[PDB]
Predict the structure of Metallo-beta-lactamase type 2.
Amino acid sequence: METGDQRFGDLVFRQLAPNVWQHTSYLDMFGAVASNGLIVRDGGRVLVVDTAWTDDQTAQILNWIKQEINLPVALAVVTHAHQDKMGGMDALHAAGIATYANALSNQLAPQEGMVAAQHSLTFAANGWVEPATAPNFGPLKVFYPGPGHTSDNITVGIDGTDIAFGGCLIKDSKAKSLLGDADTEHYAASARAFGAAFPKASMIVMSHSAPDSRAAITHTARMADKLR
Ligand SMILES: SC[C@H]1SC[C@@H]2Nc3ccccc3N21
Ligand SMILES: [Zn+2]
Ligand SMILES: [Zn+2]
């Protein structure tokens, strides 16, 4: 917890820019483990990146949005099929929110014990989302960097800001380690591809660290170089 953070139930919210917030939820494992996602205000609507670990926690994200922003949530995008990112899908579907994930994330979801998203994103060979599969994503710029943390992991830049979201692919520059589902061969190149896709992002948001500078990307890639 840090100055300027807002506690709402057992969740924490931090404003990162005029129209961007980080949501943080916690699961006991080892102690409490944090997972971060994003909330974006885009005109008269709100966009969400990643659920919380659980449905009840994700419901509280929606309650916080109602109180602090009071705009309808148009869509949510989730960045791979693990519990921290997709554990709360039912809360979104119960609320009528359109949900999006990598097609591979939706294909893996049943095996991972997750509820698949309603819609599937596909990607070009250069990693950029096929625009037809990302309808009305507004400032959310979705990029598939290649296999790393998982084979399905995706990343999201926030257009009009200096923020890019690396999900669980990127760790901060103080991390000592990065891998059960991981592609250790391609991880380093995937980390570097994320950096090259969002070359002007100066605030890197990630799932299990507080926001960091671009050094988080390079430090992560150099740690991943050692896995090969
Ligand atoms: S990246 C998916 C999440 S869900 C359970 C597993 N173990 C773990 C431990 C610490 C941080 C994150 C994690 N992961
Ligand atoms: Zn994961
Ligand atoms: Zn994670």
About this structure: The pocket of Y4E (ligand 1) is lined by residues 29, 33, 82-84, 168, 208 (CB under 6 Å). Residues 84 and 90 are 13 Å apart (CA to CA).
